């Protein structure tokens, strides 16, 4: 449980590779799932407990259920799968081999750089208020009622011209 | 490049006041007054100088305060002060909302035997002067002498002079 | 380029500092042309709707004319202004640093030889 | 840190890489924008709640509104396309060069 | 690290053709190698075998060019003793371009690359020695 | 900038944090803020390539503040070499280090 | 620690339960659809925007975050009544 | 499209960039040219037919990718120093990538192929606003970071614009997509000048624009987008040939015209900071540009092609859909060369 960051960050690699090895999507909008949910993990790790939160609500909840909605009523998997799945799996388990032996590589050149493997666990979070209140992303992310108003009201105007964009294009 | 000092283990070692949380939850209001001078020109002290190894001298004195006042409080109205916190930690947040019927019986105790009055509300919260006998530091920050501003050209504006200096293109 | 140098009072059209210059007497050929301009774009527009040239649209023909010039007049204000001031800024440079512009006094023919290069 | 920030912009060069080359689908490469993004505010949140800064943090809220809305509109288009030709490929658009 | 085509000009025109030889085939598969990447990206053929065989054969064209140049070019700097003149760059040029038109089996290409690649070469050298620096940086 | 309509109006809508040490909301302060309020009072008053020169010795210790490259590489060291101590037999880690102590 | 526990012993369960169920006996488009995601989209994201009134409202610039909700929700529904009248809620084909 | 959807899609198009350049802020920027991105796609997909959607996919995925790049490099920036603006001490690999994506996302070359098919599946009045209030913003972003570039790839960039686009033109008959790549050439020149002298570059994105506005409004006259389609304009119409033959020349930038200008002083710079050599590959390959437009002034003016009967018909009929501001941009790019000091 000090590798923690390093497996979460590993997952979402493979996550995003799984979706540049372009597989059938119902088995990539799982490896998406998975990114996601591994990355909400590691902003909670951090702290960023409102932001996490807000991802599992929005990202999953809203965006790939739709896209998962979308795809269903207008795609079709054709048999495209010349073991082509079977394939791609090999071939992401040769890239990962390839990546494990990279960073093994890597971690001799450079030691303080690019990765401390010896001290691992060191370096995630630097500095904190011990005796603090308010002190968590819920107030930056509160920040556009107060300052950084141009933040809400242009996020404003952009679902209010999304619609009738969305509605203007689908006729 | 260049060293670092500090003080040493064998020093600044004062005898803690080792006191739990509870109780220092609860007897805070009082020792907000009783107290006051000390911890006020601490803070100042350390918002002054940014040097924690410059402002020690003011923690010792900080902690004998605190220890002659618990010491009054163990000498009078001992077990109202006990039962008080022992009602207190019982909670989980530790409000001042499920023990006020503990409370003011503590506070008359002191008072008949000790001229203290729990402070107001909104008594603390207020930015007090502190007369100090020592001096205010500039460059607290030790920086450095900032570069000297651009020479600025000056001179009344007249005219350009033959035209534009561009080609046969005169006027 | 020269927009951070020292106040450049931002978006102003022509600075109070620009009263101190000679504006343009009006005959000058800058304007006239930008007049010229005007009369010949009237004329095509005429000429593209299929109307009577130069003698239809009297008014258009003056609007345009007379908008041509309203704006050259002050367009060559500001350009005025800004010349100046880049010569105004590099005389400046020049008064402040003298070492990076030896004043060299050439020398005469007689001193200097110009090598021969016949027919 | 370092390590995982290493590996989140790896997986924003595979998503790249996923978008840039294709298998025959759209959807596919409208996934991967949609990882890249992801790890884009994974990012900016994780710098923002490393240097305890604040008021940076509406950043990532907005770019990825407006990741949602981007998509959204590129999947209306994939949906046009659909109903038009008879499915999402990618080798039906083979007009426009003429 | 960039010796490999700095190493070119440590010696003037003249020995060390060798050298000279083995950098003008390294340009040679360098170039080939990205001209057939772009035309395999794009206007691609039936099978890997004949996208890979036109990805040889300009490998190997702009190699055995490179190599013809560069030896041209070291060997008339050893014979006809003014180096430094372009003339040198010039017919080593030519005789690229004219291996170029013996490859291609085409006269009129032999006879265009020889002139415009020749020109370039001997332009190149006038570059090298009167200091005309390319992908210049601003100091007006 | 481009086009000041902002600075000419006289008013800021985003240039109000565009660094790290603007005004936080309730005043908890950054990680280098001290370091960035130096910087910027040396980049100030002058434009670009004096500071790009000028300034580098307020501006890598602003660097190491954030990212803390050599910090890093000195504990590392350190470590290494303390491993390969208590390996080769010479090293006893006292208790204060070791899994124990009397804190405060 | 505790939510992996919880996690894990659910998954567990349920799995249990799959391997005891398994081992004991022995398309054209709608566009209102497309639609409707699109607005539950628009929606989320207004909520993305919302909640942190909680923290929002503790400051001193009533003034301004009372304003920016009423705008918000007003020009949202203000695009909802346009979706409306320009006929996105009536499923009639 | 009614009316209210109109409004707010020509609002959003014409905030986007506004908000682009008078933002110091890179999150602002990137915001803006989302905004452009997405109001616009619309005004190309109105017809709804395959090519518009085909178009508009590709446009959509291409300005998709250079922007999440531009959101890399931000990020990148903010990790590194702190500040959401670029400054003198970023790893130039993310400039690099900045640049790349800009490039992509304006239509310079190799990152070119997809400008020529949208604007031969778009009408005229969108290709129009594509090619001349798309390509502002992601140039303001670079007028504000031009000291720190990498003129290398820069100048490589602008004079493979040059050749690529001329060498399309020569063939190209569909007058979309020759515009398109006249586009993609002065592009090149103006980049090609950026890191020197930026006025400059806005000098010759305005000739470009009031060169071009002007050309696309003869077009949406009669929909004539194809050069048998337009060699009757003297049956037609015969009043804007001697007009156009001379806009198009512009275009060529021949020296008593204005469109020469911007060459010329934009050499002059490249000869001050010695980049001679490209300077004369592009004064030398800007020819092709000049023949592609001669040889439209050829089939339009120069000489008569066979009409078809029915324009006679059409004769008898009017059109008063030239609005003024046409001869007004015309004339004040080919006759107002003596005012190129004012100007500068
Ligand atoms: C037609 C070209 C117009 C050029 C105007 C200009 O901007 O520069 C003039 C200015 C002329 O120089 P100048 O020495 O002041 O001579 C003008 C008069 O002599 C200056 O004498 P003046 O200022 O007393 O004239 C005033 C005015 C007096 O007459 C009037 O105002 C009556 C008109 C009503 O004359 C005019 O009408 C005009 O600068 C130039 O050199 C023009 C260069 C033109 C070259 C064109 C080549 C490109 C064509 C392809």
Redesign the interface.
């Known amino acids: 449980m000090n590798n923690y960051i390093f497996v979460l960050s590993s997952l979402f690699l493979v996550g995003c590779l799984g979706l540049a090895l372009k597989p059938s999507l119902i088995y990539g909008g799982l490896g998406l799932i998975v990114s996601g949910f591994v990355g909400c993990l590691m902003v909670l790790g951090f702290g960023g407990s409102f932001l996490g939160l807000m991802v599992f609500l929005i990202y999953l909840g809203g965006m790939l259920v739709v896209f998962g909605y979308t795809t269903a009523m207008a795609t079709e998997e054709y048999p495209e799968t010349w073991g082509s799945n079977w394939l791609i799996l090999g071939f992401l388990v040769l890239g990962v081999i390839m990546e494990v032996f990279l960073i093994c590589v890597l971690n001799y050149y450079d030691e303080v750089g690019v990765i401390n493997l010896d001290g691992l666990g060191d370096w995630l979070m630097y500095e904190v208020d011990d005796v603090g209140v308010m002190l968590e992303g819920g107030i930056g992310v509160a920040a556009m009622y107060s300052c950084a108003t141009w933040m809400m009201v242009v996020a404003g105007w952009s679902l209010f011209a999304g619609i009738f964009i969305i509605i203007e294009i689908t006729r | 490049p260049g060293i670092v000092e500090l003080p040493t283990l064998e020093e600044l070692k004062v005898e803690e006041v080792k006191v739990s949380s509870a109780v220092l939850k609860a007897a805070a209001h009082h020792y907000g007054a009783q107290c006051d001078k000390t911890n006020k020109e601490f803070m100042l002290c350390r918002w002054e100088e940014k040097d924690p190894r410059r402002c020690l001298k003011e923690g010792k004195l900080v902690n004998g305060c605190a220890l002659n006042f618990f010491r009054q409080i163990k000498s009078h109205c001992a077990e109202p002060f006990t039962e008080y916190w022992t009602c207190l930690d019982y909670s989980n947040m530790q409000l001042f909302r499920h023990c006020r019927q503990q409370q003011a019986k503590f506070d008359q105790c002191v008072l008949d035997k000790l001229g203290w009055v729990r402070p107001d509300l909104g008594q603390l919260s207020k930015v007090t002067k502190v007369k100090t006998d020592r001096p205010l530091p500039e460059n607290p920050y030790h920086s450095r002498a900032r570069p000297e501003p651009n020479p600025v050209i000056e001179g009344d504006l007249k005219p350009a002079k033959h035209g534009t200096r561009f080609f046969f293109w005169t006027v | 380029m020269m927009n951070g140098r020292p106040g450049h009072e931002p978006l102003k059209f022509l600075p109070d500092e620009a009263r101190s210059l000679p504006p343009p007497k009006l005959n000058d050929p800058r304007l006239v042309y930008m007049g010229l301009l005007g009369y010949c774009t009237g004329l095509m527009d005429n000429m593209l709707r299929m109307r009577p040239v130069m003698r239809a649209g009297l008014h258009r023909q003056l609007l345009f004319v007379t908008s041509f010039v309203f704006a050259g007049y002050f367009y060559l204000k500001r350009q005025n202004y800004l010349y100046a001031v880049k010569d105004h800024d590099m005389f400046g440079y020049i008064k402040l640093h003298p070492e990076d512009f030896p004043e060299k006094e050439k020398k005469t023919y007689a001193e200097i030889l110009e090598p021969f290069h016949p027919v | 840190m370092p390590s995982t920030f290493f590996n989140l912009t790896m997986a924003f060069s595979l998503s790249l890489l996923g978008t840039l080359m294709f298998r025959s689908h759209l959807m596919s490469t409208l996934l991967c924008l949609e990882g890249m993004v992801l790890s884009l505010f994974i990012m900016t949140s994780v710098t923002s709640l490393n240097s305890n800064s604040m008021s940076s943090m509406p950043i990532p809220i907005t770019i990825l509104v407006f990741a949602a809305c981007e998509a959204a509109v590129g999947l209306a288009l994939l949906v046009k396309v659909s109903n038009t030709y008879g499915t999402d490929y990618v080798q039906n658009l083979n007009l426009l060069q003429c | 690290v960039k010796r490999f085509f700095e190493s070119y000009h440590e010696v003037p025109d003249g020995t060390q053709c060798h050298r000279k030889t083995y950098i003008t085939t390294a340009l040679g598969g360098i170039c080939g190698i990205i001209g057939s990447a772009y035309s395999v990206s794009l206007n691609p053929a039936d099978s890997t075998l004949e996208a890979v065989a036109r990805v040889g054969r300009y490998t190997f064209t702009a190699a055995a060019i490179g190599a013809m140049f560069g030896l041209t070019t070291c060997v008339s700097a050893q014979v006809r003793e003014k180096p430094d003149d372009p003339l040198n760059y010039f017919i080593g040029g030519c005789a690229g371009g004219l291996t170029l038109g013996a490859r291609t089996h085409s006269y009129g290409t032999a006879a265009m690359g020889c002139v415009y690649m020749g020109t370039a070469a001997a332009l190149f050298k006038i570059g090298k020695l009167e200091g005309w620096e390319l992908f210049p940086t601003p100091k007006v | 900038?481009?086009?000041?309509?902002?600075?000419?109006l006289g008013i800021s809508?985003?240039?109000?944090?565009?660094?790290?040490s603007?005004?936080?909301?309730?005043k908890?302060a950054?990680?280098?803020h001290?370091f960035?309020?130096?910087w910027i009072?040396?980049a100030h008053?002058?434009?670009?390539?004096?500071?790009?020169k000028?300034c580098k010795?307020?501006?890598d210790d602003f660097?190491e503040c954030?990212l803390?490259?050599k910090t890093?590489?000195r504990?590392?060291d350190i470590?290494?070499q303390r491993?390969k101590l208590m390996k080769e037999g010479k090293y006893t880690p006292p208790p204060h280090h070791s899994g124990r102590e009397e804190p405060? | 620690m505790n939510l992996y526990t919880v996690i894990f012993i659910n998954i567990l369960l349920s799995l249990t339960l799959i391997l005891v169920a398994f081992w004991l006996p022995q398309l054209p488009f709608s566009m209102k659809f497309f639609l409707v995601a699109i607005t539950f989209l628009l929606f989320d994201l207004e909520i993305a925007l919302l909640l942190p009134l909680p923290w929002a409202i503790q400051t001193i610039k009533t003034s301004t975050m009372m304003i920016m909700a009423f705008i918000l929700v007003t020009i949202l529904s203000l695009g909802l009544a346009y979706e409306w009248t320009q006929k996105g809620l009536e499923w009639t084909e | 499209m009614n009316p209210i959807t109109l409004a707010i899609i020509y609002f959003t198009i014409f905030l986007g960039p506004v908000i682009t350049m008078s933002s110091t802020n890179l999150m602002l920027m990137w915001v803006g040219l989302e905004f452009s991105l997405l109001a616009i796609i619309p005004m190309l997909i109105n017809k709804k037919n395959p090519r518009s959607t085909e178009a508009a996919t590709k446009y959509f995925v291409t300005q998709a990718t250079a922007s999440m790049i531009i959101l890399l490099a931000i990020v990148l920036n903010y990790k590194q120093l702190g500040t959401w603006m670029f400054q003198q001490q970023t790893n130039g690999l993310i400039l690099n990538m900045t640049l790349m994506a800009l490039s992509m996302k304006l239509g310079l070359a190799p990152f070119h192929f997809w400008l020529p098919e949208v604007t031969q599946g778009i009408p005229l009045h969108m290709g129009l606003i594509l090619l001349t209030w798309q390509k502002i913003a992601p140039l303001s972003i670079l007028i504000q970071i031009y000291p720190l570039l990498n003129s290398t790839i820069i100048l490589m960039l602008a004079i493979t614009s040059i050749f690529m686009g001329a060498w399309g033109g020569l063939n190209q008959t569909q007058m979309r997509k020759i515009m398109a790549y006249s586009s993609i050439a002065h592009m090149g020149w103006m980049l090609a000048i950026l890191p020197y002298n930026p006025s400059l570059t806005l000098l010759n994105l305005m000739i470009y624009i009031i060169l071009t506005a002007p050309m696309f409004m003869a077009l949406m006259l009669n929909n004539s987008m194809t050069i048998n389609s337009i060699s009757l304009l003297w049956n037609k119409t015969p009043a804007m040939l001697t007009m156009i033959s001379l806009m198009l020349l512009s275009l060529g930038g021949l020296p008593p015209l204005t469109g020469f200008l911007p060459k010329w002083i934009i050499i002059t710079e490249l000869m001050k900071n010695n980049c001679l050599i490209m300077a004369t590959l592009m004064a030398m390959m800007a020819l092709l540009n000049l023949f592609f437009y001669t040889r439209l002034i050829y089939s339009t003016s120069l000489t008569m092609f066979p009409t078809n009967n029915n324009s006679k018909m059409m004769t008898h009929q009017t059109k008063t859909k030239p609005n003024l501001m046409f001869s007004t941009l015309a004339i004040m790019s080919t006759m107002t060369l003596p005012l190129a000091p004012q100007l500068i």
């Open positions: 900038p481009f086009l000041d309509i902002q600075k000419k809508l985003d240039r109000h944090f565009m660094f790290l603007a005004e936080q909301p309730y908890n950054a990680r280098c001290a960035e309020k130096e009072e040396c008053g002058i434009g670009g390539t004096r500071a790009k000028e010795i307020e501006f660097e954030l803390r490259y890093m590489r504990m590392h470590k290494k491993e405060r």
